[PDB]
Design a protein that fits this description.
This is part of a larger assembly, with three copies of chain A (about 50 residues).
Chain A: no helix or strand
Protein name (chains A, C): Major capsid protein
Organism (chains A, C): Human herpesvirus 2 (HHV-2)
């Protein structure tokens, strides 16, 4: 009576936001150090979990 | 039949601006520059639907 | 004793905010990436629900 489960999962990697959805919920939201490029604005290649 | 009225839904012109609804009516931003949101008045208003 | 309903729902598509009503609840509420055209300002042609 002790069972088991099988659950797949689906993770997208390199996908890319639609057009309306590229923004930042505040202006200063996530800020790199002044005089550095934003790593956030590049097309994402990774996943975390 | 009686009232000749229709009931509007929860609706918005931005996906970004729709998410502000699912918190609840209170936090919804009805307008942004042009993009806007409409919040439903229905007999279904308070149900899980 | 199990019934039914008919409800009709009205969704506007291409309307446009009045003069008083075109604004943003803050300065940086939704800010596109630095140096990018902001679709938030355009007239909406779509909906979401």
């Amino acid at each position: 009576l002790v069972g088991a489960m099988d659950l797949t999962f689906v993770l997208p990697l390199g996908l890319f936001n639609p057009a309306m959805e590229r923004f930042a919920a505040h202006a200063g939201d996530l800020v790199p150090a002044p005089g550095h490029p934003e790593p956030r604005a590049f097309p994402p290649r990774q996943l975390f979990f | 039949g009686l009232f000749q009225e229709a009931y509007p839904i929860t609706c918005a012109s931005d996906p970004a601006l729709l998410r502000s609804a699912r918190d609840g009516e209170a936090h919804a931003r009805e307008t942004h520059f042009t993009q806007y949101l409409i919040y439903d008045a229905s007999p279904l208003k308070g149900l899980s639907l």
